[PDB]
Amino acid sequence: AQYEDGKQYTTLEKPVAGAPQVLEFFSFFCPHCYQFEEVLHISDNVKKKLPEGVKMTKYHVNFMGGDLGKDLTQAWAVAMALGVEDKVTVPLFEGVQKTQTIRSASDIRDVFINAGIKGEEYDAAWNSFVVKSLVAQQEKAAADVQLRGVPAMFVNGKYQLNPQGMDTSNMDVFVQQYADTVKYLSEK
Ligand SMILES: O=C(O)Cc1coc2cc(Oc3ccccc3)ccc12
């Protein structure tokens, strides 16, 4: 077949019931994730190839970056609780990987302050049980598949994208193959 298990995707040996239709995992320490955001815009290109209104979910992971990796998962929970993902994703990626000005939870907070989130409202979210539960939700989603690599995308709790099997000579061709594979998997 044109799409084959082991080529563009792999199939989870234990499928996960109740998962979101499209689920992405990333780390602000992950270099391919940085590219997926700034250069390839993978999430937006996948969204444009799926029907209107499909749910897409994106979670941060703990396993890169030690203490700060976990702080970043909590900060991503804050961003999701406050609905400010689009305001903080690029400055968090650049603060970690480009300028290397993010070295502490305080430096993370500065990114949110600079993006116009009020200090009081950041701190209230950071300490909230709603955010504690969003941290648990991110960890649980990752744990369901003993995730050890990002960027990762799962479709319908069943299929895992395999970008290792896609053309990397051309960035736009790669994005198109990735998104068309997601579309194919979502129609399975
Ligand atoms: O770990 C792997 O090999 C799989 C993988 C995940 O995200 C990626 C992003 C890439 O970025 C490019 C660069 C130039 C053209 C097209 C794509 C390349 C490969 C991968």
Residue numbers in the entry: 1 to 188
Verbatim from the authors:
The highly oxidising protein DsbA catalyses disulfide bond formation between two cysteine residues of unfolded substrates in the periplasm of Gram-negative bacteria. The structure of DsbA is comprised of a thioredoxin domain with an inserted helical domain. Like many other thiol-disulfide oxidoreductase enzymes, the active site of DsbA is comprised of the characteristic CXXC motif (Cys30–Pro31–His32–Cys33 in Escherichia coli DsbA) and a highly conserved cis-proline in an adjacent loop which has been shown to play a key role in the binding of substrates.
Phenyl ether 25 bound to the EcDsbA groove neighbouring the active site showing a binding pose to the benzyl ether 23 and the direct anilino analogue 15. The co-structure was more comparable with the direct anilino analogue 15. The phenoxy group of 25 occupied the hydrophobic end of the binding groove with the oxygen atom of the ether linker at a distance of 4.1 Å from Gln35. The side chain of Gln35 is conformationally flexible in the crystal structure and therefore unlikely to form a hydrogen bond with 25. The carboxyl group of 25 is positioned more closely to the imidazole side chain of His32 (N–O distance = 3.7Å) compared to that of 15 (N–O distance = 4.5Å) and possibly formed a weak polar interaction. The strongest binding affinities were observed for 6-phenoxy 25 and 6-benzyl 28 with KD values of 326 ± 25 µM and 341 ± 47 µM, respectively. The similar binding affinities observed for 25 and 28 suggested that the oxygen atom of the ether linker does not contribute to the interaction, which is consistent with what we observed in the co-crystal structures. LE values showed 6-phenoxy 25 and 6-benzyl 28 were the most efficient binders.
